[PDB]
Amino acid sequence: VYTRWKCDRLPVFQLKLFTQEYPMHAAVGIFTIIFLWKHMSHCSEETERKYGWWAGYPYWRDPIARRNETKYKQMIINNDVDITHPKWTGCSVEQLEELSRVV
């Protein structure tokens, strides 16, 4: 005789279980997952340094700095960003050259 658990395959039984057996529970679970990923899915660098490492943050190599450096280099190279633009520096290119000659 027909029974959901014995005859249906696992994905079908899962859908039936969470749609016609525990639908409210599934709905609340999805709600909670969305909330968690919307408000509890960020970690600042200081937080990672304080608690994000098993034995502590190895300041002697600063892996966060290398990670950010790789990120920014990849972004600049791929997107063809002119980091010498006045908006990034706040001064004209000629002023930048003058400063370079000064320092």
């Binding site: 014995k6 249906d8 395959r9 098993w54 034995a55």
Partner: protein
């Protein structure tokens, strides 16, 4: 039409890997399928030998993982911080020196909160290097 929703739509023959599967079931059933193996909510069996075998194995593999993957990080951090603050500085030492340092770290771990506090508190007048030695 593309995929069947019924488990009866077999994908292999009934005799596929019959021998190995039977051996696996023989291993599973010999000790578990017994009257005195009455589980408590499927988690706690009634067979004493199951406890006797599994508890040591679980402890062994957990301890191996902890010693070779988890505590190693703390040990390496101590070695790096106490002997230059860089990995190359530690590697400048010999294997025997590293052994000495790691065994001192184990001493500290065993002492913990009941051991003498001179292992990390420098008594006044001590001639050994301070915290600003490498600074």
């Amino acid at each position: 039409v593309l995929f069947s929703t019924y488990r009866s739509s077999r994908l292999v023959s009934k005799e596929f890997l019959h021998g190995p599967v039977m051996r696996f079931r023989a291993l599973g059933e010999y000790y578990f399928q017994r009257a005195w193996n009455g589980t408590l909510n499927w988690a706690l069996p009634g067979e004493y030998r199951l406890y006797a075998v599994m508890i040591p194995f679980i402890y062994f593999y957990h301890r191996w993982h902890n010693d070779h993957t988890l505590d190693r990080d703390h040990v390496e951090k101590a070695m790096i911080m106490r002997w230059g603050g860089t990995l190359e500085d530690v590697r400048k030492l010999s294997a025997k020196d590293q052994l000495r340092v790691r065994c001192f770290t184990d001493i500290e771990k065993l002492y913990s909160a009941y051991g003498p506090k001179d292992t990390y508190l420098q008594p006044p007048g001590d001639t050994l290097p301070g915290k600003d030695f490498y600074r």
